[PDB]
């Protein structure tokens, strides 16, 4: 469950995690699931979604 | 591909996408990759990260 950062990353929102190249990171088990960038065909809006909230169609 | 929302979701940040149960959503291809919740063992900070920025160790 352990990963290493390949690049520096600066946070853009109150919820992302800033890190430097080299840091050791562990994935946190989440009820939300992985987040994906999605576009709503229903509303035209676009943004990140919790993948546990959706199902293939 | 195309997914259907199973639940309503209200946005928490400027970057997430609010949706209602029933909406049809499409995955937007992204250089960041899927986002994961991660804990830095190096810094103790915790937040979402772009999975393309890390590698298993």
Domain count, chain A: 2
Considering the domain architecture, whether residues A20 and A37 belong to the same structural domain is answered as: no
Residues of A in contact with B40 (CB under 8 A): 17, 19, 23-25
CA trace torsion B4, A34, B32, B7 (10° rounding): 30
Considering the domain architecture, whether residues A35 and A21 belong to the same structural domain is answered as: no
Considering the domain architecture, whether residues A3 and A17 belong to the same structural domain is answered as: yes
Phi and psi at residue B35, to the nearest 5°:
-100, 140
Contacts of range B2-5, beta carbons closer than 8 Å, 24 or more positions apart = B2/A41, B2/A56, B2/A57, B2/B26, B3/A38, B3/A54, B3/A55, B3/A56, B3/A57, B3/B27, B4/A54, B4/A55, B4/A56, B4/A57, B5/A53, B5/A54
Considering the domain architecture, whether residues A3 and A20 belong to the same structural domain is answered as: yes
Considering the domain architecture, whether residues A23 and A44 belong to the same structural domain is answered as: no
Q: Domain limits at B8?
A: 1-57
Put simply, the answer to whether A17 touches B46 (Cβ < 8 Å) is yes
Task: Point out the residue among B36, B47, B54 whose CB comes nearest to the CB of A6.
Answer: B54
CB atoms < 10 A from the CB of A33, how many? 15
Resolution in units of Å = 1.6
């Amino acid at each position: 469950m352990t990963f290493v950062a390949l690049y520096d990353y600066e946070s853009r929102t109150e919820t992302d995690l800033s890190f430097k190249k080299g840091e050791r990171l562990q994935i946190v088990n989440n009820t939300e699931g992985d987040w994906w960038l999605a576009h709503s065909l229903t509303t035209g809006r676009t943004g990140y979604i919790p993948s546990n909230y959706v199902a293939p169609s």
